[PDB]
Amino acid sequence: KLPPGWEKRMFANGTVYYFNHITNASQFERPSG
Numbered sequence: 001k002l003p004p005g006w007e008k009r010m011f012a013n014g015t016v017y018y019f020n021h022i023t024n025a026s027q028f029e030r031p032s033g
């Protein structure tokens with residue numbers, strides 16, 4: 001589905017984004033590394 005450590009996450013206002021649990025990185029666009 002997603003690259004190593006990445007998973008979907010969401011803000012309290014209902015806005016969805018991508019988050020890396022291993023590196024603490026974040027993106028509004030679907031990740032590739």
Ligand SMILES: *[C@@H]1O[C@H](CO)[C@H](O)[C@H](O)[C@H]1O
Pocket residue numbers: 011012013014015
């Ligand atoms: C939802 O809140 C986040 C920050 O919590 C961000 O500003 C988004 O743009 C907003 O839609």
